[PDB]
Amino acid sequence: MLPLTLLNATQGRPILVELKNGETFNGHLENCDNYMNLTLREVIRTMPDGDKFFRLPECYIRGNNIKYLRIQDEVLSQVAKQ
Amino acid sequence: SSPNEFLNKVIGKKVLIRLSSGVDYKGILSCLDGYMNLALERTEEYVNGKKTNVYGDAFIRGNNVLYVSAL
Amino acid sequence: MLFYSFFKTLIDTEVTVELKNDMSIRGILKSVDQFLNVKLENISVVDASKYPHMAAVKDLFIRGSVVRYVHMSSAYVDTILLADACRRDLANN
Amino acid sequence: SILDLSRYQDQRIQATFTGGRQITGILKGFDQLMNLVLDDVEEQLRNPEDGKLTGAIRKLGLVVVRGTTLVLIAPMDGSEEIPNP
Amino acid sequence: AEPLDLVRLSLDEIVYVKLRGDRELNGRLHAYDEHLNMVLGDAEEIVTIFLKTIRKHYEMLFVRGDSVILIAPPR
Amino acid sequence: ILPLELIDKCIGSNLWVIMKSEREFAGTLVGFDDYVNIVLKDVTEYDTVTGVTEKHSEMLLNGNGMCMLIPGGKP
Amino acid sequence: SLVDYVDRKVIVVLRDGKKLIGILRSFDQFANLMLQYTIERIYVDDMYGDIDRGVYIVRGENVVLLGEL
RNA sequence: UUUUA
């Protein structure tokens, strides 16, 4: 199962996004596209040093700013089953 | 295209090229392409304020170009 | 695909890849693709103690985009045929 | 776009650029390339070394934002700096 | 008539190359492409570190084009 | 309001350009292309770390690093 | 291609210096990677410690290298 | 908008 297919299957589920500068965004994945652009809801934004935190109701992240994404193992299992 | 009109009118004239690194090149603009690759004649290289090199002809890869300015 | 073909002529020979992160890896070139991704086998890392996480790796893939250099021993046939091929591309394309 | 920017029309949004610049402004227009027109823009200035926000702002007025250098967009309403969750 | 002609006319000549990361190369140009990927023969690299310079030599050296800033043909 | 229509309405007027780095330009907008590479005339360039400024009579600015374009120029 | 590494344990080195060790499950034409049962291994000289991390999707441009373990 | 910025 391709990486972006899993990403599409993660819509509606919690995700962690780390940006190239080390900022992290914890939220529910609302939408994504083939650029890996993302929209998230109910977001916690952590600054690189881990020193300042923000709550955002939603946000949009341009795909070419992404370092990596983390998703629950349960998600990969349930998506593989379906 | 205004960018192309400007470039067409400084071809064969002395220009200042600033790279994103801030290194400067002063030279005679010979020609350019669609990637903003440049060929200069009579090129002087400047770092901070000091002249560090000269080249009779220099090729500059376009991705590093911050601007081309008339002199 | 001039340099793709060049590297396909170096498969099963020893090369050293210097990465943009300044690590150098020597090994046998086993694979190369259109992007100049490479696969190396029986690798040895230069200044290996500086890169302890590499100690148990024998085979690896390197993304072409992170390469600064690939260097190798010279051969006359290699050099004149490569120059020939570049001039051939220029005359044809 | 997966983001329907018309939902933010006449709302204050926060925009972050590649390289670290951060602004807020009221969305007045946009195009399919995610260029924006924002009004009443304020830029949150950063410290030269650490690159962290200093708390000071500068007012920029009516601004065209380039979609190519945009990395983050989020509405201001409902946002807040919070302690470690 | 186009900038890459400067590189074309430098085939089999000793060129100077300025690269990102405070590096310079001098070597015989054996091949290049539109990315400015190139192969230099009998090449010397000067790495400047901040003041100090380290010199290295390569019998045959492939250079990925995205590091290239400037190429100068020989005088 | 369409962003590029606002820029086109600024032609012949002052425009203030803020780069992603600590660098800014202010001058008269001559024109721009589909990638928003911009030609400015009677320009002032600002290094906003050192505070040094430089003048240029006319220049083509690469649009790659541009973050903001502010019609009406710099205060 | 990377198909030879699928379902094998690998170390992935990222541009920011992070070391991820996990099971490669998939990849695409950008070398985007999907890893399962991943740990992040933090080194200080020859010493290290591990953090359980779960599933990653690594965006290909951040991948320096992938090594079979 | 990821392997030629």
Q: Residue A20 CB: number of other CB atoms within 10 A?
A: 17
Contact B3 F59 (CB under 8 A): no
Q: How does F5-23 read in b/e, with b if 16+ C-beta sit within 10 Å?
A: ebbeebeeebbbbbbbbeb
The torsion angles phi and psi of G20, rounded to 5 degrees, stand at -110, 135
Cβ C16 vs Cβ C26: under 8 Å: yes
Residue G11: strand pairing partners: G21, G67
Here the tokens at position A2 are 């391709």
Nucleotides of H under 7 A from a protein CB: 1-5
How distant, in Å, are the alpha carbons of A58, A62, B31, B47, G18 from that of C68? 39, 27, 28, 24, 20
CATH number of the domain encompassing residue A9: 2.30.30.100
Q: Which residue carries 């200069």 as its tokens? A: B40
The closest CB to that of C68, out of E30, E59, E64, belongs to: E64
Residue (of B32, B35, B24, B42) closest to B7 by Cα position: B32
Q: What is the extent of the structural domain holding C53? A: 1-93
Question: Which run of H or of E encompasses B3?
Answer: helix B2-10
Q: Domain F1-75 is in which class?
A: mainly beta
Please count the structural domains in chain A: 1
CATH number of the domain encompassing residue B26: 2.30.30.100
Contact G32 A4 (CB under 8 A): yes
CA-CA distance, D67 to F69, in Å (whole number)?
Answer: 12
CA-CA distance, D33 to G60, in Å (whole number)?
Answer: 24
CATH number of the domain encompassing residue D37: 2.30.30.100
Torsion of CA B45, E24, E8, B53, to 10 degrees: 20
Contact B31 E1 (CB under 8 A): yes
Cβ G23 vs Cβ G7: under 8 Å: yes
Please count the structural domains in chain C: 1
Which chains does C contact via 3+ CB–CB distances below 8 A? E, G
DSSP state of C34: T
Cβ A8 vs Cβ A15: under 8 Å: no
How distant, in Å, are the alpha carbons of A23, B23, E22, E46, E54 from that of E51? 35, 17, 11, 12, 10
Which amino acid belongs to residue C75?
A
The torsion angles phi and psi of C53, rounded to 5 degrees, stand at -65, -10
- Residue numbers in E near C2 (CB within 8 A): 31, 33, 37
Question: β-strand F66-71 against F53-61: which pairing, if any?
Answer: unpaired
How distant, in Å, are the alpha carbons of C82, E46, G27, G45 from that of E39? 9, 17, 31, 36
CA-CA distance, E4 to A51, in Å (whole number)?
Answer: 49
Q: How does C49-74 read in b/e, with b if 16+ C-beta sit within 10 Å?
A: eebbbbeebebbbbbbbbbbbbbbee
Q: What is the extent of the structural domain holding A5? A: 1-82
How distant, in Å, are the alpha carbons of C76, C79, E28 from that of E59? 11, 11, 10
Interface test with B, best of F45, F57, F62, F66 (most B CBs within 10 A): F62
Residue (of F39, F67, F40) closest to D66 by Cα position: F67
Whether chain A has a CB inside 8 Å of the CB on G55: the answer is yes
Å between CA of C76 and C1' of H1: 43
Contact B70 F33 (CB under 8 A): no
CATH number of the domain encompassing residue C47: 2.30.30.100
Cβ B30 vs Cβ B10: under 8 Å: no
Annotate chain F with three-state secondary structure: CCHHHHHHHCCCCEEEEEECCCEEEEEEEEEECCCCCEEEEEEEEEECCCCCEEEEEEEEECHHHEEEEEECCCC
Cβ D60 vs Cβ F70: under 8 Å: yes
Which chains does A contact via 3+ CB–CB distances below 8 A? D, G
User: How far does the CA of residue E20 sit from the closest CA of chain B (Å)?
Assistant: 9
Q: Residue D51 CB: number of other CB atoms within 10 A?
A: 11
Q: Residue C21 CB: number of other CB atoms within 10 A?
A: 14
CA-CA distance, A57 to D82, in Å (whole number)?
Answer: 13
Which amino acid belongs to residue A38?
L
Cβ D13 vs Cβ D76: under 8 Å: yes
DSSP state of E14: E
Q: What is the extent of the structural domain holding B48? A: 1-71
User: How far does the CA of residue D62 sit from the closest CA of chain F (Å)?
Assistant: 6
Residue (of G25, G54, G49) closest to G38 by Cα position: G54
Q: Where are the beta strands (DSSP E) in B14-64?
A: 14-19, 24-32, 38-47, 50-60
Cβ G33 vs Cβ G24: under 8 Å: yes
Q: Residue B60 CB: number of other CB atoms within 10 A?
A: 27
**Chain G 13-32 residues whose Cβ is under 7 Å from strand H:** 29-32
Contact E67 C68 (CB under 8 A): yes
Which amino acid belongs to residue C42?
N
CA-CA distance, F63 to F38, in Å (whole number)?
Answer: 7
Q: What is the extent of the structural domain holding D48? A: 1-85
Q: How many residues does chain A have?
A: 82
Residue C26: strand pairing partners: C16, C44
CA-CA distance, E72 to B50, in Å (whole number)?
Answer: 20
User: How far does the CA of residue E64 sit from the closest CA of chain C (Å)?
Assistant: 6
> How does DSSP assign G8-40, residue by residue?
SEEEEEETTS-EEEEEEEEE-TT--EEEEEEEE
Q: How does F37-72 read in b/e, with b if 16+ C-beta sit within 10 Å?
A: bbbbbebbbbeeeeeeeeebebbbbbbbbbbbbbbe
Cβ F26 vs Cβ B33: under 8 Å: no
CA B51-E29-B57 angle, 5° bins: 35
Cβ A44 vs Cβ D85: under 8 Å: yes
CA-CA distance, G41 to D66, in Å (whole number)?
Answer: 38
Residue (of G58, G27, G20) closest to A1 by Cα position: G27
Burial of E47 (0-12, 13-18, 19+ CB in 10 A): middle
Which amino acid belongs to residue F27?
G
Handedness of CA D8, D10, D11, D14 (dihedral sign): positive
Residues 6 or more apart whose Cβ sits within 8 Å of residue E1: B31
Overall fold of domain E1-75: SH3 type barrels. (2.30.30)
